[PDB]
């Protein structure tokens, strides 16, 4: 196409009006109707009550070289809206209809506003069971003074009742699983605002790829309908087994199963463990999102592990109860216990400060030591969630606050609080361009004048927190004391008395007592994603930052080493990542290059994991 000639205008130029056209090519002329609708709206949105199109022409050049398009427009004047007259079978709702109809006298007529008012009347009536209202509207034009009056013919019709709610997509899940999520009860009046709750509820569970709502009339009765939901189950969870047997490892194994839906019953499970010559690990986690019919949840986990030299082990239990307090907020609380023991520890400044605050007196530079405690704790938290998807959110925000407090009588005295937040904001009517913010904070400390135990310290960095850095790389590093090592014949020169002469810096992360991490991501569509991928893979661009610091660090005794009390040493990186919902789950592929780094930082520009978080 070479040129589109729009003629007959005086109020607007061609350059602006043509800017809303889809055409700007050969064999595409069939889309012209949409541009004409655009013109009708453009002028109708400005009060041109008499605007119309008298003719259009499309023609070929000689020898099919190009196309000319010409549109003949008759442009009228602007009309004012004097008021709105509403009459008919209002059925007692005239006050709300009038409130939805109020305008400022003298406002420019806008055809879209009229359509919106009609749609709002239908929406209002749907709330009270008027499933099929009959609403029509039309303008009255007085040309003597360019005045338009709006007339609306409203007939609410009949109330509808729901006779049965049927499902046709449950191949594995129990029927009860979906009925628990409906907020519309059978044998009661229909509410459009109540039925729509079901399509959100069935998405928040995260068990379905799609939820299709429907309303069908009963052929034998003018006032009853059936509601039918169609779902397609997403394969969820996996079972893994591996063999670690070898000539160096001996006989070893790894195995576990994790599902967010167990055999379709609604219970979540996780069973994991491994055994080899140097460490043992096992964990069992089971929880019931529905203990009672009203949504009270209950579950917990048991765990055990040990590591050989330093040498340590721990085990414990956590039982948590929780429940909703409104449609969107919920609370959790529970109790637990952990046993911990250490032996053959390398002398460290932070660890020894802890031990001295605890009343322990380890010998200087001597690995022949041990320590053990039994700690009983109280767990609690709070959540908020209005996201519209289980895996790839498009709107809403999520907040998850958690924490722990020790119980007097325990060996350790501490508290810990964390906060996990994320917000999705769309910038696209088709929800393809979205801005996602994510933040995390955490802080804790001791009570009674004692210190926080070092094994509960926070670490940051890794593909789950700050992309591009090695796991647990961000934060204060260990400083070792100079001397009872059994590795002296071969090894760390600072630990062995033969070479250990003074205090030394190191790259061994100890973690901190406070952290803050944040990032911003842009979620976008790409030209290389086909329908097979359009529904399963998300492509995004991102910028990450974060900082971890040591509360109660005392720099006054250490002048030749970095000061870890300064929280401002923020590490930052940026990059691009792809999140793919494969048959094995939401795998995450990412590459990033740190651009702001500090001494001691370890980089890992490319990371991959199996996702299933964030």
């Amino acid at each position: 196409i070479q040129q589109i000639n729009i003629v007959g205008n005086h109020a607007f130029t061609t350059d602006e009006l043509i800017s809303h056209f889809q055409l700007r090519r050969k064999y595409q002329k069939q889309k012209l109707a949409g541009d004409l609708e655009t013109l009708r709206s453009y002028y109708l949105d400005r009060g041109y009550a008499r605007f119309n199109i008298d003719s259009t022409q499309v023609s070929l050049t000689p020898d099919k070289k190009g196309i000319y398009v010409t549109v003949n427009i008759t442009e009228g004047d602007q009309y004012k809206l004097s008021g709105v007259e509403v009459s008919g079978n209002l059925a007692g709702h005239s006050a709300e209809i009038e409130q939805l109809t109020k305008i400022e006298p003298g406002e420019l007529y806008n055809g879209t506003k009229v359509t919106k008012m009609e749609d709002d009347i239908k929406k209002l009536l749907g709330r009270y069971g008027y499933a099929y209202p009959r609403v029509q509207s039309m303008p009255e034009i007085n040309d003597a003074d360019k005045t338009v009056k709006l007339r609306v013919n409203v007939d609410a019709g009949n109330r509808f009742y729901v006779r049965k709610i049927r499902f046709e997509g449950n191949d594995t899940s129990k029927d009860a699983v979906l009925r628990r999520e409906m907020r519309q009860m059978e044998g009661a009046w229909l509410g459009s605002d109540l039925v729509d709750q079901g399509k959100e509820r069935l998405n928040r569970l995260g068990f379905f790829e799609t939820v299709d709502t429907d309303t069908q009339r009963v052929p034998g009765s003018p006032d009853q309908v059936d509601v039918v939901y169609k779902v397609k189950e997403r394969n969820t969870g996996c079972f893994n087994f591996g063999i670690g047997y070898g000539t160096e490892s001996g006989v070893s194994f790894q195995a576990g199963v994790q599902q967010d839906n167990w055999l379709g019953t609604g219970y979540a499970v996780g069973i994991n463990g491994t055994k080899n010559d140097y460490q043992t690990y096992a964990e069992l986690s089971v929880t019931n999102p529905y203990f009672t019919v009203d949504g009270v949840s209950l579950g917990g986990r048991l765990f055990y592990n040990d590591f050989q030299a330093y040498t340590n082990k721990s085990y414990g239990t956590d039982v948590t109860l929780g429940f909703p307090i409104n449609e969107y907020n919920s609370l959790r609380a529970g109790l637990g216990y952990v046993h911990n023991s250490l032996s053959n520890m390398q002398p460290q400044v932070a660890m020894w400060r802890y031990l001295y605050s605890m009343g322990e007196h380890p010998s200087t530079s001597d690995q022949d030591n041990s320590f053990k405690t039994d700690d009983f704790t109280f767990n609690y938290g709070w959540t908020y969630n209005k996201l519209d998807r289980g895996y790839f959110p498009t709107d809403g925000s999520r907040v998850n606050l958690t924490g722990k407090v020790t119980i007097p009588g325990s060996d350790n005295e501490y508290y810990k609080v964390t906060l996990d937040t994320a917000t999705y904001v769309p910038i696209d009517d088709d929800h393809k361009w979205v801005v996602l913010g994510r933040t995390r904070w955490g802080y804790g400390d001791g009570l009674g004048g004692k210190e926080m135990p070092f094994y509960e310290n926070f670490y940051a960095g890794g593909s789950s927190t700050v992309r591009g850095f090695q796991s647990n790389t961000i934060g204060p590093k260990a400083v070792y004391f100079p001397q009872a090592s059994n590795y002296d014949p071969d090894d760390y020169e600072c630990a062995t008395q033969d070479g250990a002469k003074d205090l030394c810096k190191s790259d061994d992360a100890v973690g901190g007592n406070a952290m803050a991490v944040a990032s911003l991501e842009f979620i976008t569509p790409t030209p290389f994603i086909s329908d097979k991928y359009a529904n399963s893979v998300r492509t995004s661009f991102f910028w990450d930052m974060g900082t971890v610091w040591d509360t109660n660090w005392d720099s006054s005794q250490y002048s030749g080493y970095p000061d870890y009390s300064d929280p401002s040493n923020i590490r930052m990186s940026a990059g691009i990542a792809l999140q793919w919902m494969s048959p094995l789950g939401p795998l995450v592929f990412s590459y990033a290059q740190p651009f702001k780094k500090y001494d001691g930082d370890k980089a890992e520009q490319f990371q991959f994991n199996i996702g299933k978080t964030w």
């Binding site: 394969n235 996996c238 063999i243 070898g246």
Partner: peptide, 24 residues
């Protein structure tokens, strides 16, 4: 040293790195 048996079913033998993965 390995095999692809079914969608969501993977097996292999890979001293050894033998493993199996099954997803529902």
């Amino acid at each position: 040293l390995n095999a692809e048996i079914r969608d969501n079913v993977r097996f292999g033998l890979e001293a050894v790195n033998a493993n199996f993965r099954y997803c529902f």
